[PDB]
């Protein structure tokens, strides 16, 4: 891929990707932070730019799905302490449209606790690219640490082409 598209230092989006584990998880089970924010009331003429725009004080966007009709989008930034200060302090004023809360962004919808934007997750419940993009994901993700039962890490990037996925 281009260097732009490479967690390396060097990039001016280079992130950490903590990895920590977790005794309390269930046998066979993953713990995964949402870097996947959900915005909705997106007004009819604000595009990808101004969302990723209006979000760059609080956090550095990596990518936009905008449903413009809807009035939604799904927005995922580079890291989760980014995706946090988002919820904390964007937008407090209401002065604009926007709400936003958790969205998933990895595994399965009802493996999500949207109140603290985590998942829960049943290894058999991933894909064989899920458990290849946890893996080998440039942000988020284990950096190369194979997936066992307690591992927590964030959400790690996925590939349009090169899989089916439990989301």
């Known amino acids: 891929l281009y260097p732009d598209e490479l967690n390396v230092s060097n990039n001016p989006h280079y992130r950490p990707k903590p990895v920590s584990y977790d005794s309390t998880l269930p046998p066979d089970h993953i713990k995964v932070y949402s870097r996947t924010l959900f915005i909705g009331g997106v007004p009819l ?8 725009n209006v979000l760059k004080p609080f956090a550095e966007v990596q990518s936009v799905i905008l449903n413009n009709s809807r ?11 980014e995706a946090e200060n988002v919820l904390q302090n ?4 209401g002065a604009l449209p926007l709400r ?9 919808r009802d493996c999500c606790d949207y109140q603290h934007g985590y998942s829960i997750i049943p290894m058999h419940r991933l894909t064989d ?39």
């Open 45 to 52: 003429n604000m595009k990808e730019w101004d969302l990723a």
């Open 71 to 81: 009035k939604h989008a799904f927005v995922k930034v580079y890291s989760r302490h």
């Open 90 to 93: 964007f937008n407090k004023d």
């Open 100 to 108: 936003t809360r958790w969205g998933v962004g990895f595994g399965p």
């Open 129 to 167: 690219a899920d458990k290849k993009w946890s893996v080998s994901a440039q942000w988020g993700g284990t950096s190369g640490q194979p997936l066992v039962t307690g591992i927590v890490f964030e959400e790690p990037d996925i590939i349009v082409g090169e899989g089916v996925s439990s989301k």
